[PDB]
Each structure stands twice: as structure tokens, then as C-alpha cells.
Amino acid sequence: MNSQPFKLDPKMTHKKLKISNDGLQMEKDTGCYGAAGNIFIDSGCHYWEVVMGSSTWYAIGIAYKSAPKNEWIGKNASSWVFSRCNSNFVVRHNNKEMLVDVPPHLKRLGVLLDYDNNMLSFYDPANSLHLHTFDVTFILPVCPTFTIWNKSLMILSGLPAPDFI
Amino acid sequence: SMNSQPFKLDPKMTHKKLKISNDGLQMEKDGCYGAAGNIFIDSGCHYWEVVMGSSTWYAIGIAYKSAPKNEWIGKNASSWVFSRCNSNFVVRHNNKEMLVDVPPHLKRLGVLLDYDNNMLSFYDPANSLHLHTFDVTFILPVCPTFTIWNKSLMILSGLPAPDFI
């Protein structure tokens, strides 16, 4: 795997978000406060995790540059996200959403971007569990996106594929 | 480079009232509640991190096997911990504690066990900041220990040390 490490991009992060000095944590200081990773990916296979804790409302995924800044909740043709709203989990892309069954107490999300094999997959790593795979023939470079309403989020990047993947 | 390997909580060392994720990396309380990592270290240099989130009372460190089970909060000669209790941070060993100046909003603790060079160091990795170093001539192998009185912890093991260390 090619898992390039990355940080949250201060140039692409909503002003209502405070980013840690090491670029791996964000918390709140349309209503959606988005941040983008500081890399674009156009090859290889990459895995990162997000620690969401008790956050009840978020959208995590990837986007083309053709997705406008802070529009990373799967409501255009350039944004793919896994999203939580209370007990309802969906994947969403181009305003089309599909319900995803998730075991209770999801605190950490795994994101597997297999760019070369045209897949974006979401995982519940605590349960070693695949949640959903988008089959996408990517036509532009993609960057990680993280959108929250409140509370906080930490990114675990540059990761080897977990043994169960 | 570091010798850090992935470890998880040892199920046989976990307090009965802790809820543990299936991958052994998350512990939650629904009298301190201690758990120990499933590795005893007697060589090399190791780094792991703990995500504490909103927990206001925890103790994180290492222990010899001679520390009694669940007595991993620095109140014997076999336990070295970094601990938060509300707004006070201390390191504690052999039932003696020293206050530690910690920047606000510590959500993640770095633990650097340099077993070969007889040191245990605690870090605020978000701020690339050294917090405390114990000099310890280790006479037995040591295991990671994690103790909470509320909320939850997540263990980040086997990941590359941050560049600043």
C-alpha cells in the first residue's frame, strides 16, 4: 500500500474549525464545517482512519477539486462520503444516498481509497467490518475530506492496511 | 527507527466493568478501571499514543508484573504513570507525584518507552511538546497500562513516532 501521510489543510478548512498544531485534530471553535486533507491522490491504495468519538453528525470521504470548498457532504458529483446522523448511517454521492448498517458504538471509521482499482471503501475497524464500497472509476485526483457540526475529529493517516482488509 | 509493534488490551488484564472493542483498542466505562497491554517489553524503543477524548480522570503508563492487577496508577514502586484528575496533571510513581504543566485541551498523549536507555517519556504530540521524562533503570519487563475513572480511551500502537521525537 501507498498510504501517503497527510494533515488537515489550513487553506481548505472552515474558519469555525480549530486545527491542532500537528494538523491531525480539529474541533469546532449551510451548517457544515468541512476540512480537506493536504494531499491529492491519483494512484495507489491508501488507508486512513478517523476517530470521531461521540460525534453524532459528520461526513467523511473524498472529493475532486471540482467539488467547491466546504461542499464535501456527497451533494455533488465530486464528493463521496460516509455520513452519520444520529443512528442513521448513509453513504452519499451526487445527492444519492444509501443506508448502511453499522454496529452500535461506532467511534472510529476506516477509509480505504484503492485508486488504482476504482474503489472507495468504508470500514468499522474496531469490528474488523466492511461497511460499504463505492465502485468509482476516478477521473481526477481526490483529496480526503472531513466535515462535522460539533465536537472533534482526529485523523490517523499513512496507515498500513489493517490485517483484516 | 522505533521498535513499536501493534499491541492491544490483554483481555485477562481488563477490569470487569470496562467495555472493550473487539480489536482490543478501545476501552470505555459505562474505584479506578485499569487495563494492560498484551505485551511485556524488555528491549528496544517503543512509542504509542492514547486518545483520551473528554475523559477527565485517567492514568496512563507502564508497569512491572509486580504491580498488583488494577494498581497501575503510580501508587507502588512497579507503576509509572501520567495522570489527569480534572484540571490537574501529574506524573506519579511509588506513591509520589509531581505536577506537570500541560497545554490546554490535551486530547492525546504520547508515551515513549525507551527501554534500552532506561527512560519513560510523556508527550503532547498535538503540540510537539515533551511533558515529562522518568529515568528508570528497568529491572523487569514492563507492560503498557491504561486506567480510567470515566469516559473512554483509544490506543494507537505500532504507528511511526512523530518527526519531532
Numbering used by the authors:
A (entry chain A): 531 to 559, 575 to 710
B (entry chain B): 530 to 559, 576 to 710
The publication says:
The tripartite motif (TRIM) proteins form one of the largest subfamilies of RING-type E3 ubiquitin ligases, comprising more than 80 members. TRIM family members typically contain a RING domain usually catalyzing ubiquitin transfer; one or two B-box domains mediating protein–protein interactions; and a large coiled-coil domain region, which is involved in self-association or oligomerization with other TRIM E3-ligase proteins. About two-thirds of human TRIM proteins feature a PRYSPRY domain, also known as the B30.2 domain, in their C-terminal region.
A characteristic feature of the putative substrate-binding site in the closely related homologs MID1 and MID2 is an arginine located at the C-terminus of β-strand 7 (R587 in MID1 and R637 in MID2) that projects its guanidinium group toward the center of the cavity and two neighboring tryptophan residues lining the pocket. The orientation of the side chain of the two tryptophan residues in MID2, Trp602 and Trp694, showed an intriguing variation in the crystal structures. The MID2 domain was solved in two different crystal forms. In the C2221 crystal form, which contains one protein molecule per asymmetric unit, the side chains of Trp602 and Trp694 engage in π-stacking interactions. In the other crystal form, in P212121, which contains two molecules per asymmetric unit, an alternative orientation was observed in one of the two chains, with the side chain of Trp694 swinging out of the pocket.
